Amino acid sequence: DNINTLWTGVNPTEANCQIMNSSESNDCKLILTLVKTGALVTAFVYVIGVSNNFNMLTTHRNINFTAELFFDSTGNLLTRLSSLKTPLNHKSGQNMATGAITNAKGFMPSTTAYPFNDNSREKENYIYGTCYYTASDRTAFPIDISVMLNRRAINDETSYCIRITWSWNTGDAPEVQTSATTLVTSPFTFYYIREDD
Amino acid sequence: DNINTLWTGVNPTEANCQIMNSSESNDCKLILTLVKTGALVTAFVYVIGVSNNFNMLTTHRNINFTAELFFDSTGNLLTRLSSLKTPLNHKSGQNMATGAITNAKGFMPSTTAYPFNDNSREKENYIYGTCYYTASDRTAFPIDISVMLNRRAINDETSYCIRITWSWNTGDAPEVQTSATTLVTSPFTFYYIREDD
Amino acid sequence: DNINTLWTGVNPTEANCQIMNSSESNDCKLILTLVKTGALVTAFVYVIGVSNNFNMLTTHRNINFTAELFFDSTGNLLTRLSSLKTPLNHKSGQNMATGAITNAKGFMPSTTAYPFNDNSREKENYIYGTCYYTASDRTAFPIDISVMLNRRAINDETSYCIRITWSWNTGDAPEVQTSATTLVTSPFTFYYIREDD
């Protein structure tokens, strides 16, 4: 059953993702778990902030950040182009397994269900939902999430795309500078029709 | 694993569903994927509009449309009574497999969890959530979704029912006539306790 | 596949849960289904009210009630400390199987992903979402749901914790005394990274 999961592992020691291009290094831990579920992938995702600049986004009224995930034709993460810098792997306890995936193409968003560059079908490339930031006062602050699958390639090397955008546009920021600690999002689970191996 | 999915296939060429009774033919593509997940079915559903009359619903402030899915005692779609006119089948790549289902009863909503004609238990027959229409300005327009399982049969032939209602009641329509194109809903995933085979 | 589910069974005859400490006995049926899905558990939960005092909560503007689920190191329900008084079991038709679980540890919330007593990681212990009460006028009344995993133990015996809180804080109650019947919540499905066996 371990091969039915493609994931980041649980709570890596170091930030594995540069979600802001304004950062000088990886600025958060992107926790991403993809599970093969029949014709679908169950996708489970959140961020644990690390860098101060990312963590202090909780003091802003308007925020938008995107984890751009690009994969080659074999379903392997293109780390040089992607926000996530650590390739995914199968489940091994609470950690990533060692070597070499590629039933991985089977975890990718279907190019039949989610096309590239098709303006007449562009609405089909989008998934939306809500996750939450737990504020210092323990209230659940709603964060809008938008997932775009495929749709726009960077180059001929990028055969699959998963772009996950967290955003909010509220009357007030969830924190002030004196109350802000770590930007963590609650797990968001979404589903998509998967490519075949 | 292909037999664990019962679905419509991906993006059929022609509309497979008459979701408005006001239409003169099938007016949209109902994409429906049911996956057996332990004691539950994971149900994944959305519509891709085809007919102009259905697509132009995006210019209305108040809209309601329901995909009524009726199945016989073996879990086979009663196409003559249902909004969906194309029987479901197992996964074969991105398409439907050929012949003959019926581990299909195992994909049906449980008559023990979701009874028929039981007013004292009627609240148990309902699932709710939210999906989204991607407007021409790329904003996510929230659409209310209500699923009623079993509860009300058409006749003695209809052993199982899945009624999926999309609706919105807003201060403004998501589109004007000059901006409206295709009514597509983002995938909605819901869960229910499944009947046994 | 029956062993991949840990659940309460469907619609037990008697209330199996004391969700209000103000009740004189079990006051509702907690329907809980946990399904192993790759590295995750798919958790499916709702309540069917039984006692009048619980059912009449629908006449209040502000309500909060929590199902506290505590498990020992083997993943078995500590009924003496928990809101749920009926141990979970595997799937057997629409009912619970007989004897003895414990691939059950594998259904528990990961202590690596969801730590105990770690203030610096506390935001990671929370999941949120929305479910709905179907009011007498058939409108869907939104109920806020908050799940806290692990985080706070009662004693050294409680190795795992799932605390599920339903709440609402609205301008008006969903019912009046003359219209109120049964407090039923629509199924809420959430996901978490699971402990290994």
Side chain identity at residue C180, one-letter code: A
**Gap from C170 CA to chain B (nearest CA, Å):** 19
How many CB atoms sit inside 10 A of residue C160's CB? 27
Cα C45 to Cα C18: distance, rounded to the nearest angstrom: 15
Q: Is C158 within 8 Å of C108 (Cβ atoms)?
A: no
CB of C64 less than 8 A from some CB of A? no
Side chain identity at residue C177, one-letter code: Q
Within 8 A of B131 by CB-CB distance, chain A residues are 128
Cα A57 to Cα A59: distance, rounded to the nearest angstrom: 5
In 3D, which of A118, A100, A108, A46 has the Cα closest to residue A75?
A108
User: Which chains border B (3 or more CB–CB pairs < 8 Å)?
Assistant: A, C
Within 8 A of C91 by CB-CB distance, chain B residues are 38-39
B46 contacts: CB under 8 Å, gap ≥ 6:
B30, B31, B131, B184, B185, B186, B187, B188
In 3D, which of C186, C188, C121 has the Cα closest to residue C151?
C121
CB of A119 less than 8 A from some CB of B? no
Within 8 A of C126 by CB-CB distance, chain A residues are 132, 134, 140, 186
Burial class (CB in 10 A: 0-12, 13-18, 19+), C141: buried
A61: tokens are 């009224």
CB of B128 less than 8 A from some CB of C? yes
Asked if C120's CB is within 8 angstroms of A186's CB, the reply is no
**Gap from B120 CA to chain A (nearest CA, Å):** 33
C46: tokens are 């709702």
A172 contacts: CB under 8 Å, gap ≥ 6:
A61
In 3D, which of A103, A101, A81, A85 has the Cα closest to residue A32?
A85
Cα A160 to Cα A39: distance, rounded to the nearest angstrom: 17
Residue ranges with strand state E in chain C: 5-7, 28-37, 40-49, 62-71, 91-92, 95-96, 126-134, 140-149, 160-169, 188-193
CB of C38 less than 8 A from some CB of A? yes
**Gap from C102 CA to chain B (nearest CA, Å):** 17
| Structure's resolution in angstroms | 1.5
**Gap from B116 CA to chain C (nearest CA, Å):** 14
Number of residues assigned to chain A: 197
What experimental approach yielded this model? Answer: X-ray
Q: Is B156 within 8 Å of B99 (Cβ atoms)?
A: no
User: Which chains border C (3 or more CB–CB pairs < 8 Å)?
Assistant: A, B
Residue of B47, B189, B194 best to disrupt the A interface, most CBs of A under 10 A:
B189
Within 8 A of C132 by CB-CB distance, chain B residues are 126, 128
CB of B196 less than 8 A from some CB of C? yes
C-alpha dist (Å) from residue B23 to A50, B8, B58, B114: 54, 21, 16, 31
Please spell the DSSP secondary structure of C2-30, one letter per residue.
GGGEEE--SS-SS--B---TTSSS--EEE
A156 contacts: CB under 8 Å, gap ≥ 6:
none
Containing B54, the helix (H) or strand (E) segment is helix B52-55
Asked if A7's CB is within 8 angstroms of C112's CB, the reply is no
Within 8 A of B182 by CB-CB distance, chain A residues are 120, 123
B151: tokens are 């509860």
The angle at the Cα of A177, spanning A171 to A179, to the nearest 5 degrees, equals 90
Handedness of CA C128, C133, C139, C141 (dihedral sign): negative
**Gap from B87 CA to chain C (nearest CA, Å):** 26
Q: How far is CA A40 from the centre of its chain?
A: 17
C172: tokens are 């008006």
Handedness of CA A159, A105, B95, B197 (dihedral sign): negative
**Gap from A191 CA to chain C (nearest CA, Å):** 13
CB of B133 less than 8 A from some CB of A? yes
Output A1-4 pairs: Cβ under 8 A, ≥24 positions apart.
A1/A91, A1/C36, A1/C38, A2/A90, A2/A91, A2/A92, A2/A97, A3/A90, A3/A103, A4/A35, A4/A36, A4/C38
Asked if B35's CB is within 8 angstroms of A37's CB, the reply is yes
**Which of the 8 DSSP states describes residue A116?**
B
Number of residues assigned to chain B: 197
Cα C107 to Cα B38: distance, rounded to the nearest angstrom: 13
**Gap from B178 CA to chain C (nearest CA, Å):** 33
CB of C129 less than 8 A from some CB of B? no
**C140 vs B37, B146, B190: nearest CB:** B146
Of chain A, the end-to-end C-alpha distance in Å amounts to: 17
Domains and CATH numbers, chain A: 1-197 (2.60.90.10)
CB of A192 less than 8 A from some CB of C? no
Asked if C193's CB is within 8 angstroms of A189's CB, the reply is no
Handedness of CA B37, B39, B42, B43 (dihedral sign): positive
**A91 vs C39, C123, C192: nearest CB:** C39
A163 strand-pairing partners: A68, A148
CB of A129 less than 8 A from some CB of C? no
CB of B113 less than 8 A from some CB of C? yes
In 3D, which of C34, C24, C1, C29 has the Cα closest to residue C14?
C29
What SS3 state is found at A129? Answer: strand
Within 8 A of C5 by CB-CB distance, chain B residues are 38-39
